[PDB]
Paper text:
A structure of GSK1278863 (2.45 Å resolution, P41212 space group, 1 molecule per asymmetric unit) with FIH reveals binding to the metal via its amide oxygen (trans to Asp-201), and one ‘pyrimidine-trione’ oxygen (trans to His-279); the GSK1278863 glycinamide carboxylate is positioned to form electrostatic interactions with Lys-214 and Tyr-145. The lack of inhibition of FIH by the clinical PHD inhibitors is also notable (and consistent with cellular results), since the extent to which HIF target genes are regulated by FIH activity (and FIH inhibitors) varies.
The transcriptional activity of the HIFs is regulated in an oxygen dependent manner by 2-oxoglutarate (2OG) and ferrous iron dependent oxygenases which catalyze the post-translational hydroxylation of HIF-α subunits. Two proline-residues, Pro402 and Pro564 in human HIF-1α, in the N- and C-terminal regions of the oxygen-dependent degradation domains, termed NODD and CODD, respectively, of HIF-α isoforms are efficiently hydroxylated by the HIF prolyl hydroxylases (PHDs or EGLNs) under normoxic conditions. In a second 2OG oxygenase-mediated mechanism of HIF regulation, factor inhibiting HIF (FIH) regulates HIF transcriptional activity via 2OG dependent hydroxylation of an asparagine-residue in the C-terminal transcriptional activation domain (CTAD) of HIF-α isoforms; such reaction reduces binding of HIF to transcriptional co-activator proteins (CBP/p300), which are histone lysine acetyltransferases. Here we report studies that inform on the activities, mechanisms of action, and selectivities of the PHD inhibitors (and related compounds) in clinical trials for anaemia treatment, i.e. Vadadustat from Akebia Therapeutics currently in phase III, FG-4592 from FibroGen in phase III, GSK1278863 from GlaxoSmithKline in phase III, and Molidustat from Bayer in phase II.
Residue numbers in the entry: 15 to 116, 119 to 349
Write the structure that this text describes.
């Protein structure tokens, strides 16, 4: 259901810019910050798109030119990929899995604009994705925009939910067609879209069985093993039962991605560059009186801890698998 831009500017996007996948989805609600329904969705840790937060209102004028002029001289982490399917490799965990081979490159902002402009010409199949946490090295005008964010609203949300401290603000600038594969994060996230359009497909924590994350010690920890473009239903049979929550966010929209919810993010094809700012918050602390049965994301937390501990106990991540199979084979299956 593509939205109609004001001023009769025509459809902002059409379904031809969306990639096709095998699973069905239901839409994420697009609500107003003043709507109590959006307030309970955040309280019940369910996704919602807020359309009128003014959270990054001063940033809605950002583009490659404005940023290059005022972002300043600093190092920005840039990730390269030979195709649309990006993928992340925890550098620290590269040691555990020696066989795997991957990617990232540091550079000043103008260098990124040159590469993005260089690849613009030639129709190069390569794609890039800038992802850098905001720090003090940003120029004057960018700090003014940063201060112009709606801190009143988001800070009130932080207290209302008892969340932890704002861990970081992440600036994401991507090329059209970029795909962030399905993965889950362990912190609460307000996904503030600025430039371009991004299709966000979320899956609840209870669909862990359908998305098959890599081992915790694997560099791709928290990412799905399933190739959405070509699912291996033999290895990943329960992916045929996956059902996602879908939406397309545009400038001014804020998507709440609750902690441990999977998200598959893609910048629309032929939609130009996309710009996003994320607000990361440590989740609310675990209550003192645990209510059973546990939430799905609590069981995911338990599973993560077991794998982590067996890695230390056995003194080798590679032994975690064999010992877990020995434990269940013919005893719990
Ligand atoms: O694209 C968006 O709008 C939202 N993107 C994200 O939340 C990303 C993300 O959470 N992650 C990792 C976070 C830590 C745990 C493993 C996944 C990414 O690597 N990436 C990219 C993945 C490809 C390689 C560079 C980093 C994310 O985008
Ligand atoms: Zn994420």
């Amino acid at each position: 259901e593509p939205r109609e831009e004001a001023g009769a500017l025509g459809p902002a996007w059409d379904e031809s810019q969306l990639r096709s996948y095998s699973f069905p989805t239901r839409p994420i609600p697009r609500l107003s910050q003043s709507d109590p329904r959006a307030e309970e969705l955040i309280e019940n840790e369910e996704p919602v798109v807020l359309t009128d937060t003014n959270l990054v209102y001063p940033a809605l004028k950002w583009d490659l030119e404005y940023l290059q002029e005022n972002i300043g001289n600093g190092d920005f982490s840039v990730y390269s990929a030979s195709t649309h399917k990006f993928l992340y490799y925890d550098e620290k965990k590269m040691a555990n899995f020696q066989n795997f081979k991957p990617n990232r490159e540091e550079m000043k902002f103008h260098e990124f604009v040159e590469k993005l402009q260089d690849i613009q010409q030639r129709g190069g199949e390569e794609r890039l994705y800038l992802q850098q946490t905001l720090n003090d090295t940003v120029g004057r005008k960018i700090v003014m925009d940063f201060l112009g964010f709606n801190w009143n609203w988001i800070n009130k949300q932080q207290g209302k939910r008892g969340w932890g401290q704002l861990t970081s603000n992440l600036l994401l600038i991507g090329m059209e067609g970029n795909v962030t594969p399905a993965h889950y994060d362990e912190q609460q996230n307000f996904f503030a879209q600025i430039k371009g359009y991004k299709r966000c497909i979320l899956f609840p924590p209870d669909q862990f069985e359908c998305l098959y994350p890599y081992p915790v010690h694997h560099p791709c920890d928290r990412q799905s093993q399933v190739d959405f473009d070509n699912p291996d239903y033999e290895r990943f049979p329960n992916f045929q039962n996956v059902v996602g929550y879908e939406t397309v966010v545009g400038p001014g929209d804020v998507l709440y991605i609750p902690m441990y919810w999977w998200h598959h993010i893609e910048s629309l094809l032929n939609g130009g560059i996309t710009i996003t700012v994320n607000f990361w918050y440590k989740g609310a602390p675990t209550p003192k009186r645990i209510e059973y049965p546990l939430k799905a994301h609590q069981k995911v937390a338990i599973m993560r801890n077991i794998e982590k501990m067996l890695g230390e106990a056995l003194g080798n991540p590679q032994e975690v698998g064999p010992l877990l199979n020995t434990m269940i084979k013919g005893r719990y299956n």
